[PDB]
């Protein structure tokens, strides 16, 4: 059963994502806007980025990196500046 949705990254009819295979609230909030296509696209790119950045997910620095880029690429309409690391104390 291919459920048709409108993916932000495609701006057209797309097939909805599968189910909660790890996330929950964020998962479904993204699944309804993101097709399997875009989901695969980004996760490939970020995996590549992680190989370049050599970052670990145990640090808020690199953890918020993932968050910034992920939301900006998939959801697009984020409120956070994509500067990677924030040199300002007040965020």
Curated annotation (Swiss-Prot):
UniProt record, GO biological process: cellular response to oxidative stress
Keyword Iron carried by entry: yes
SUPFAM superfamilies named in the record: YggX-like
Pfam families referenced in this protein's UniProt entry, alphabetically: Iron_traffic
Signal peptide segment: none
Record flagged with keyword Iron: yes
A cellular component term, taken from the record's GO annotations: cytosol
Gene Ontology MF, one: iron ion binding
Record note on what altering residue 7 to S does: Strong decrease in activity
This protein's UniProt keywords: Iron
InterPro entries xref list: Fe_traffick_prot_YggX, Fe_traffick_prot_YggX_sf
Main function: Could be a mediator in iron transactions between iron acquisition and iron-requiring processes, such as synthesis and/or repair of Fe-S clusters in biosynthetic enzymes. Necessary to maintain high levels of aconitase under oxidative stress.
Protein family per UniProt: Belongs to the Fe(2+)-trafficking protein family.
Protein's name in the database: Probable Fe(2+)-trafficking protein
């Amino acid at each position: 059963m291919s459920r048709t949705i409108f993916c932000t990254y495609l701006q057209r009819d797309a097939e909805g994502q599968d189910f909660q295979l790890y996330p929950g609230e964020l998962g479904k909030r993204i699944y309804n806007e993101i097709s399997k296509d875009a989901w695969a696209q980004w996760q490939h790119k970020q995996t590549m980025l992680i190989n370049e950045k050599k970052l670990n997910m145990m640090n808020a620095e690199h953890r918020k990196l993932l968050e910034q880029e992920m939301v900006s690429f998939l959801f697009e309409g984020k409120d956070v500046h994509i500067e990677g690391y924030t040199p300002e104390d007040k965020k």
